[PDB]
């Protein structure tokens, strides 16, 4: 690639999450941006069905 | 979101190599207090935008545990071991919820990562580690909206070097 | 398909008590060679006909193992332990898949059974056993059509009695 | 009385959707059994993702 | 104390076939709350009297759990699956310790049973079940003397029959 | 014949040594049962490390 | 041999703090192919010389597996998570045997480390990582004599730093 | 401690290992030396009973 000047510095992403945990159905959407080669990213996740979640959001962190 | 990893020491990047087609992953997380969380994910690339589609099934979380009590604190950082199996990548990692009160609740993630490219078009990495730092920067609304940050580094165990030249 | 159980001795029938609303179940099965099979199910009653809706996520099955190679033999019978937890029912069972070469590939089912009725409307059973025999009666079409039979009995440990008045 | 909604012989039908090791599939099925005798039979048809690339046995307990 | 089993139906008795030399067993029991209890045993015959020698290593039991708090209730009965592996016998069983507050603390025994006779001298059993009821009959002295009873039966799944001619 | 070495009623004796969660203990025991009927009883005595600081129940299957 | 660890970033050294009296540890290692290896160890200090006393019980290793076939290659490096539980230290780590042929056989170590000093005399470390590099430098004689090297570093996950100032 | 000049640079150790794995009894002894603050060490282990081991030595590595 020569140098970092020819790599994409940032890349957006969108997500949809659907599931059931202990019998509770939920759906989420999400939007974020990251730096693919620096290995960092940030996103906002919203629960659009089944909110507020009756369990800790943390069990969904690795799936987002 | 495995496209966003900083690989050092020349470790091949299975995820970035898989585009434009992308990749999937599949995972079961087993919690020490009985809970299971299984997920399947598709990653594709729609022009310049990554698109994730995830399905989740979780069960057997104890009603008195930190998850169903909504009494989780925050995730510790973690280090996944990643290696080739059956011509795809396997990962395993032990994560730990630091609950409010000091006590940790651990879990064990078992993952397969599958390129949509054929294995012969890919340079597979050897056994290595992926540090993951995931953090809730803001609970915008309690069980409805969250801002999350992650940093991830693919590396070898350089702090305790081999006396034989192994990674 | 837990509505089909012959209960003996005193034992309350959680499933047949749950109508007409029905019940759900949630399960993760862990296989000794690394596979996971997670399933959620809904059981309803549509005028005389029971209706089942099932979602499955399975992962991490070894490419060289009997499941992914499609060289499994048959299921042995099994005995599930069943007891109340968190005002619903939990079950655990070890199953064993006979495979070529005299191998048994075992797995461990972790299930939660949830009535759609409130727990106050239910007579909850004590700890007991469900014997289950599941048999693939016919491979009608190699990987496209199968016929399956099951017999189940809910019972206490009659063969080896208590000396202290316990079931 | 809950059990009054059930009969000595009852039919059932099923719909199954899933992914195993990256492989998507869908099934339907129809059976009949005697709920109080604890016996049942069914026929399952893989309508999508067939012929399955894995042993059907792993779906037995979900049907 | 596996010499004490009533076998029914055709089932060969691995243990009573092993005399006068005897047999050993090796086991790790995993508890759902993190405890491990590993044991090795030797069974010999000293003129009409069976002699048992046992070594135990247990670890990781939670300080706040029923075991370390000494606030366990009693064992439910259980059903072990037993089958030939590597020319010796393997067993697996889920046990459940009743504890205060309507809790069941379950564990999973993984055992290998090894005759001291060569496998060529033995009639090996097919896959079967051993029902076991173990009961602490008396706490004679709080944590210094106990009386314990056991009944066991080796059997097939008689309650739920095969339609294909299988045991 | 192997089973000819056994009787309708037989005694047994045991010695147990172990460590659980850092706690060392030793037991002996003596029992009797009917091997072919599948029934047995025994008395276990903690001779070292007593009174145990954990539930005896975890030693039941080893005795 | 946990006295020989380089701690960085000011992490308290539970092991060095425990002398002169020393410490114990207790461990069960569960292998993915069914094997269990349980060990208890005592560490004391006899003048200037450390003395270790270890007891081991291992079982259920498959006769066809790399361990009982004596077909293990070498251990990968690994990273243990270490944290306080019940006023002592718990550790968990996933290790991987790199077998001859490329395939990895993994295992999961569950350890408790117990100081012989009372917890009030100790500064306990927070959640952190221990890198371990263990290597056979020489098979002097095949199943009889070995020279082994280890390097170990206690650290935090610094490669992927927190955006909130957490370790 | 002031500086490294007042720390013990090296410390010897001795070990005894006794156990049974899949029904095979063995005993080992060992001798080694390490640097406690650099976090390195080396040892020689000898099987004095039950050798040669009928299983891979590697399952004993973390116990030595």
What is the 3-class SS of chain B, one letter each residue? Answer: CCCCCEECCCCCCHHHHCCCCCEEEEEEEEECCCCEEEEEEEEEEECCEEEEEEEEEEECCCCCCCCCCCCCCEECCEEEEEEEECCEEEEEEEEEEECCCCCEEEEEEEEEEEECCCHHHCCCCCCEEEEEEEEEEEEEECCCEEEEEEEEEEECCCCCCCCCCCC
Give CA–CA dist B105/B99, Å, rounded.
7
DSSP characters for E13-30?
-TTTTSTTT-EEEEEEEE
**Cα separations (Å) of F51 from C61, E57, E69, G164?**
47, 18, 13, 49
Looking at 2.40.155.10, 3.30.2320.50, 2.30.42.10, 1.10.10.1100, the CATH number of the domain B1-167 comes to 2.40.155.10
Is F21 an 8 Å CB contact of chain G? Answer: yes
CA distance E27 to E40: 6
CA dihedral angle for residue C60, residue C62, residue C66, residue C68, rounded to 10 degrees = 70
Beta strand H11-21 with G49-59 is parallel
Give the Cα separation of E30 and E41 in Å (integer). Answer: 18
Cβ-contact C85, C92 below 8 angstroms: no
Among G118, G43, G105, which residue's Cα sits nearest to residue G74?
G105
Whole-number Å distance between alpha carbons of E111 and D47? 42
C34 bridge partner residues:
none
Q: Considering only CB atoms, which chain B residues are within 8 Å of G137?
A: 163-164
CA dist B95 → A58, B134, C34, D1 (Å): 11, 11, 19, 48
Cβ count near A43 (within 10 Å): 22
Parallel, antiparallel, or unpaired for β D10-20 and C145-155? unpaired
Rounded CA gap, C88 and C78, in Å?
A: 22
Length of chain A in residues, anyone? 64
CA distances C128 to B148, C7, C131, E76, G12, Å, are: 45, 10, 10, 9, 50
Q: CB burial class (10 A; 0-12, 13-18, 19+) of residue B94?
A: buried
Is the preceding peptide bond at F51 cis, omega within 30 degrees of 0? yes
G98 neighbors G148 (Cβ within 8 angstroms): no
- The values of phi and psi at residue D52, to 5°, are -55, 140
φ, ψ of residue D60 to 5 degrees: the values are: -50, -50
Beta carbons of B144 and A51 less than 8 angstroms apart = yes
CA atoms within 13 A on the CB side of F41: 8
G158/chain B closest Cα distance in angstroms = 9
Region of G139 (left: φ > 0; alpha: ψ -120 to 50; beta: rest) is: beta
Residue contact G166–B102, C-beta within 8 A: no
- Picking from E38, E60, E110, the nearest residue to G112 by CB comes out as E60
Fold of A1-64: 3.30.1300
3-state secondary structure (DSSP) of residue E4: coil
b/e code E133-163 from CB counts within 10 Å (16+ = b) = bbbbeeeeeebbbbbbbbbbbbbbbebbeee
The residues, ordered by sequence, that sit 6+ positions from F1 with a Cβ below 8 Å of its Cβ are none
Read off the tokens for G50.
Answer: 């450390």
Task: With residue D45 as reference, give the H or E element that holds it.
Answer: strand D39-48
Residues of chain G found within 8 Å of residue B92, distances taken between Cβ atoms: 94, 106
C-alpha span between E128 and E83 (Å, rounded): 7
Going by CATH, does the domain composed of D1-63 fall within 3.30.1300.40?
A: yes
Query: CA of D40, closest CA in chain B: separation in Å?
Result: 27
Which chain B residues have a beta carbon less than 8 Å from that of G92? 94, 106
Find tokens 């009372």 and name the residue.
G118
Q: Which tokens sit at B144? A: 């409805």
**Is the preceding peptide bond at E20 cis, omega within 30 degrees of 0?**
yes
3-state secondary structure (DSSP) of residue H18: strand
Q: Domain map of chain A by residue range? A: 1-64
Q: Is C76 on the interface with A (CB under 8 A)?
A: no
How remote is the C-alpha of C38 from its chain's centroid?
A: 13
Whether D and A touch, i.e. at least 3 CB pairs below 8 A, reads as no
- Residue C34: both structure tokens together: 């690394």
Cα distances (angstroms) measured from residue E88 to each of C90, E112, E126, G52: 33, 7, 12, 35
- For chain D, give the longest Cα–Cα distance: 45
For F25, counting Cβ atoms within 10 Å of its Cβ (0-12 exposed, 13-18 middle, 19+ buried), the class is buried
Q: Name the nearest CA neighbour of D57 among E159, C136, G40.
A: C136
Q: Is D21 on the interface with B (CB under 8 A)?
A: yes
Q: Give the closest residue to B97 by CA, choosing from B69, B119, B55, B120.
A: B69
- The conformational region for residue H6 under phi > 0 = left, psi -120 to 50 = alpha, else beta, is alpha
* Element at G15 (helix H, strand E): helix G14-17
Residue whose entry in the numeric block shows the structure tokens 């008195």: B64
Residue G146 vs residues G135, H29, H31, H57: alpha-carbon distances, Å: 10, 11, 11, 9
Cα–Cα distance, C114 to E99 (Å, whole number): 23
Residues of E in contact with H24 (CB under 8 A): none
**H/E run at residue A12:** strand A11-21
Among B7, C26, C70, smallest CA distance to D54 is for: C70
* Residues of chain E neighbouring B33 (CB-CB closer than 8 A): 33
Which residues on adjacent β-strands are paired with residue E92?
E81, E110
Interface test with A, best of B9, B94, B146 (most A CBs within 10 A): B146
What method was applied to determine this entry? X-ray
Query: What is d(CA E15, CA E22) in angstroms, rounded to the nearest whole number?
Result: 8
| C-alpha atoms less than 13 angstroms from C-alpha of E12 in its C-beta half-sphere | 15
- Return the residue matching tokens 């056993």: C129
User: Among residues E105, E37, E29, which one has the least CA distance to residue E73?
Assistant: E105
3-state SS assignment for residue E102: coil
Any chain A CB within 8 A of the CB of C55?
A: yes
């Amino acid at each position: 690639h020569g140098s970092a000047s020819f790599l994409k510095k940032t890349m957006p992403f969108k997500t949809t999450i659907e599931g059931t945990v202990n019998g509770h159905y939920f759906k989420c959407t999400g939007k974020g941006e990251g730096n693919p080669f620096e290995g960092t990213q940030e996103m906002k996740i919203e629960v659009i069905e089944g909110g507020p979640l009756p369990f800790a959001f943390h069990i969904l962190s690795t799936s987002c | 979101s495995k496209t966003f990893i900083k690989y050092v020491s020349g470790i091949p990047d299975y995820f970035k190599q898989s585009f434009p087609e992308g990749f999937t992953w599949e995972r079961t997380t087993t919690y020490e207090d009985g809970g299971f969380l299984t997920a399947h994910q598709d990653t594709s690339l729609d022009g310049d935008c990554l698109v994730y589609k995830v399905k989740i099934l979780g069960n057997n979380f104890p009603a008195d545990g930190p998850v169903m009590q909504n009494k989780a604190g925050r995730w510790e950082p973690a280090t996944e071991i990643v290696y080739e199996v059956d011509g795809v990548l396997r990962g395993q990692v032990l994560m730990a919820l630091k609950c409010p009160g000091g006590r940790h609740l651990t879990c064990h993630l078992h993952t397969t990562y599958r390129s949509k490219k054929p294995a012969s078009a890919l340079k597979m990495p050897g056994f290595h580690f992926e540090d993951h730092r995931i953090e809730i920067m803001e609970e915008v609304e309690k069980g409805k909206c969250y801002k999350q940050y992650e940093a991830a580094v693919g590396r070898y165990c350089d702090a305790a070097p081999s006396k034989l030249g192994h990674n």
